[PDB]
Amino acid sequence: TGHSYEKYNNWETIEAWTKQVTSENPDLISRTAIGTTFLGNNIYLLKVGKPGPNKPAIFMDCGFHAREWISHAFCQWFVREAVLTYGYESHMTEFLNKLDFYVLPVLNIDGYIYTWTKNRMWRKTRSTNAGTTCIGTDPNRNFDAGWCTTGASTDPCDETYCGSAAESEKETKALADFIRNNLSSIKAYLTIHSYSQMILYPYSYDYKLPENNAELNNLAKAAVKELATLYGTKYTYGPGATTIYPAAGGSDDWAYDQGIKYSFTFELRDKGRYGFILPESQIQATCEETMLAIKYVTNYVLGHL
Ligand SMILES: N=C(N)Nc1ccc(Cl)c([C@@H](CS)C(=O)O)c1
Ligand SMILES: [Zn+2]
């Protein structure tokens, strides 16, 4: 149960960590719960930044999908990085002074616990579905963005099940609610996933392109270029629909349609050699290079407020 930044941590440890890291940095972090999961776990949210009046914000979540362990690891890495370098590294110092980072460590807590106890490859939530033994909804197919029109299954037995309705899951309803309640400050939305090594932006529910797609393409291009500087890791980027494939009900498209102009889905290491079972030996190299892209994007957004 002891926490480590170079190891995958179970929920009990991550929860204890959210409490301790907040206790150790009261001037930089405040913890809050934005909802409760289907099984009663608390969906924590860390507000990282120097407190001040009416600051803009960047929202970043991890752990949408249970099996994507590197995602959960990154949110934790990001927070230590933030508090450890504030006051010493100019860029991070300026970010924390000017804006707040809303870090959601693990969204799909129930599914994450399940990967630790019964099925390492679980993806969905763990809610029950009427008229069947099949469990869970794909949280990334449960948002009100062309809900369940494509790339999503209507069968609860499938891994991409869209749900009984948009925001049917307490997790996604809690996330949508928080965001809806803070639209005035949230300038960018970053949702962390694995694996594939990619940076995607809207849209996925449709082949139509976002108004600022050229700006988003330049941004994604610059960010993957910055990420490659550390270890040479190659990322690709583009609109979801054409780069990956059409998939409705994603949070990146939803957030964008709420007015959040900078919205990205990150696909972390690797390309498939280890896939979802990325070795703990790769946690630091992955989080470090990923830090470069996130910080690049943060500086861009700040310069365009
Ligand atoms: N709205 C979307 N479908 N966004 C989106 C973009 C790229 C990728 Cl890789 C995904 C994956 C993440 S596992 C997924 O949820 O299937 C979703
Ligand atoms: Zn995912």
Side-chain angles (χ1 to χ4, degrees), residues 140-193:
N140 213 31
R141 295 298 188 286
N142 199 232
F143 289 78
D144 193 46
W147 182 77
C148 210
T149 54
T150 192
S153 163
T154 59
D155 192 343
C157 295
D158 299 352
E159 297 284 69
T160 57
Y161 179 47
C162 70
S164 50
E167 295 185 39
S168 44
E169 305 305 277
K170 296 187 68 171
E171 298 77 11
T172 63
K173 174 56 90 182
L175 210 242
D177 280 345
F178 172 83
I179 291 173
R180 278 192 296 258
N181 286 322
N182 294 270
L183 278 189
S184 65
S185 62
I186 304 170
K187 310 301 178 181
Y189 176 76
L190 310 177
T191 179
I192 315 302
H193 299 256

Side-chain angles (χ1 to χ4, degrees), residues 64-65 68 123 193-194 267:
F64 239 72
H65 297 124
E68 301 169 16
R123 165 181 172 95
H193 299 256
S194 79
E267 276 282 66

Side-chain angles (χ1 to χ4, degrees), residues 96-149:
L96 267 27
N97 280 335
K98 305 287 153 283
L99 54 74
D100 296 315
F101 278 107
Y102 275 122
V103 179
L104 205 172
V106 188
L107 176 66
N108 186 7
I109 295 151
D110 301 346
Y112 187 58
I113 288 166
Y114 203 70
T115 60
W116 269 79
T117 62
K118 293 305 188 66
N119 195 342
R120 178 59 180 80
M121 289 291 288
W122 192 262
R123 165 181 172 95
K124 304 190 293 177
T125 55
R126 292 297 299 173
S127 62
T128 60
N129 294 286
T132 184
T133 35
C134 289
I135 300 293
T137 296
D138 186 332
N140 213 31
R141 295 298 188 286
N142 199 232
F143 289 78
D144 193 46
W147 182 77
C148 210
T149 54

Side-chain angles (χ1 to χ4, degrees), residues 25 28 79-88:
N25 308 275
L28 237 32
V79 173
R80 176 178 63 170
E81 176 82 2
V83 309
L84 216 57
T85 66
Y86 175 76
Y88 301 101

Side-chain angles (χ1 to χ4, degrees), residues 65 68 123 138 140-141 160 193-196 198 200 203-205 240 244-253 265 267 276:
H65 297 124
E68 301 169 16
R123 165 181 172 95
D138 186 332
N140 213 31
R141 295 298 188 286
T160 57
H193 299 256
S194 79
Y195 59 97
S196 272
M198 300 181 149
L200 311 135
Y203 286 103
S204 286
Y205 73 78
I244 311 300
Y245 48 72
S251 64
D252 60 354
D253 292 347
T265 296
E267 276 282 66
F276 299 113

